[PDB]
């Protein structure tokens, strides 16, 4: 019922992101470092894990 085009389109906004292993923030997926001060603007990140 819900189509893959808008699926990917929304994934840009909900899924296609990266995650700080410390600050837990929702980061642009291609970023190198966390934009957040509290984690020291560190580099230790990950991708937001994928669903099912």
């Amino acid at each position: 019922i819900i189509e893959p085009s808008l699926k990917a389109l929304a994934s840009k906004y909900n899924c296609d992101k990266s995650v700080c292993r410390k600050c837990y923030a929702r980061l642009p997926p291609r970023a190198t470092n966390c934009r957040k001060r509290k984690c020291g603007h560190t580099n230790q990140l990950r991708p937001k894990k994928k669903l099912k």
Binding site: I1, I2, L6, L9, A10, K12, Y13, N14, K50, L51
Partner: protein, 190 residues
Amino acid sequence: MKYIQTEQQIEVPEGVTVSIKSRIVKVVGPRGTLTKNLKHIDVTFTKVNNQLIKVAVHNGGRKHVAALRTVKSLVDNMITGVTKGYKYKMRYVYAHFPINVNIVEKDGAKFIEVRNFLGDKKIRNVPVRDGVTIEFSTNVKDEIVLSGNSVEDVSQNAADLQQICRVRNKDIRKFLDGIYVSHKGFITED
């Protein structure tokens, strides 16, 4: 290392005019006019012809230098808005609940009105900024568009409409509903 002089360049095409006085910018063209204040940056300008301006910094550090480019880019954005216009198309998304969307005016306020988002009884109301205008698409379904000369207002009310329909307490990876920006371009050149 305190770069002694750096500069960026701005084209002014035909039919456009600009007025700068103490970092107070007027930019006029066919779409209309756009104004800005940049007194929070210390920088110099120079008309060299009616076709070009230089912006310049003398003896600036790195972060001081960085603002030159974005300021130039912002000016270019204003120019492109007052000439070509800006146009931001979104798309509605839903799998079970049809998102209901209308416009409604309280004393001429023009709040966008949203209903049935995930079946909620909640009606969401988002005001319409000045200088920005909206169109529901007919040729294609659920494609509503904003447009105007001010990218700031356009982009901001668009993202307002984005973040206002943000799901709570649910795994969005499954629950992808909302309104999401599909396209951004200009009014002109299609």
